Amino acid sequence: SKNVVIYADGVYDMLHLGHMKQLEQAKKLFENTTLIVGVTSDNETKLFKGQVVQTLEERTETLKHIRWVDEIISPCPWVVTPEFLEKYKIDYVAHDDIYAWLKRAGKFKATQRTEGVSTTDLIVRILKNYEDY
Amino acid sequence: SKNVVIYADGVYDMLHLGHMKQLEQAKKLFENTTLIVGVTSDNETKLFKGQVVQTLEERTETLKHIRWVDEIISPCPWVVTPEFLEKYKIDYVAHDDIYAWLKRAGKFKATQRTEGVSTTDLIVRILKNYEDY
């Protein structure tokens, strides 16, 4: 079947199984896809969303090891625009109303976040070995 | 060129860029390879090496997302034997003297560990935002 260009974006700080599963889900939305992944900039992520431990370079370098990722846009724009979709020939944006225009265009595909699998969740489990009293 | 079966093993707890780079290095030891990755058991890792936050299932599931990994043996044997290499048709073991017999057999290929890129290193960086005083 025809190849379908999927776009997903995010911070991908301390990349964990949750990110990985969401990228796999985007990659598998259709039989034949190219998954493009956008990685948000340090300055915009910190200004608009919250704290980030790893630099853009570290987050991008780690993402390149993930088998679902076909292309990385690093840094990506903070806000997706129709001109951006046209520039990269993107057929669907995979995401989990600023997205209203994507749905109106037929270019929205839902993916899911997995709970309980994050990197900080692992550290919390480490800390649980030490009793309060 | 002929396909070369490479074996690497480890704990792969809180998989990080360091693991990823070492797996890439093993995968790229020859032009055409199959990289088999062994994941050590919870009980043997804890008994012989040290603490592990993630279960075998979690560590194995996370590894499957890494693009260099062609096959996973989960759990793998704690000690590699010549019979194991024969069973899986392994041409080289990639590792970073219990390995003496591998070198004597011509089946040892060195890989490198990367410093400063581990998951706990990231948490230390988080903690550095809070001054002692």
Closest Cβ–Cβ partner in A20, A53, A122 for B126 = A53
A 73-102 residues inside an 8 A Cβ radius of B:
none
Q: Are A88 and A7 in contact (CB under 8 A)?
A: yes
Q: How far is CA A112 from CA A18, A109, B2, B123, in A?
A: 9, 10, 41, 26
What single DSSP character describes residue A84? H
Q: Are A58 and A42 in contact (CB under 8 A)?
A: no
Give the total residue count for chain B.
Answer: 133
Q: From which experimental method does this structure derive? A: X-ray
What gap in Å lies between CA A44 and CA B80, rounded to an integer? Answer: 48
Count other C-beta atoms under 10 Å from residue A100's C-beta: 9
Angle between helices A56-63 and B17-27 (to 10 degrees): 40
What's the gap between Cα B100 and its chain centre?
A: 19
Q: Are A24 and A68 in contact (CB under 8 A)?
A: yes
B100: its two tokens: 């003496």
Cβ of A17 within 8 Å of Cβ of B67? The answer is no
B18: its two tokens: 């360091």
Residues of A in contact with B124 (CB under 8 A): none
Residue extents of the structural domains in chain A = 1-133
Residue B66's closest chain A neighbor by CA?
A66
Structure resolution, Å:
1.6
Choose among A76, A104, A57: nearest CA to A8: A76
What gap in Å lies between CA A52 and CA A58, rounded to an integer? Answer: 11
Choose among A40, A35, A34, A25: nearest CA to A112: A25
Cβ of B68 within 8 Å of Cβ of A68? The answer is no
Angle between helices B56-63 and A17-27 (to 10 degrees): 40
Count other C-beta atoms under 10 Å from residue B49's C-beta: 12
The 10 Å CB-count burial string (b at 16+, else e) for B96-109 is: eeeeeebeeeebeb
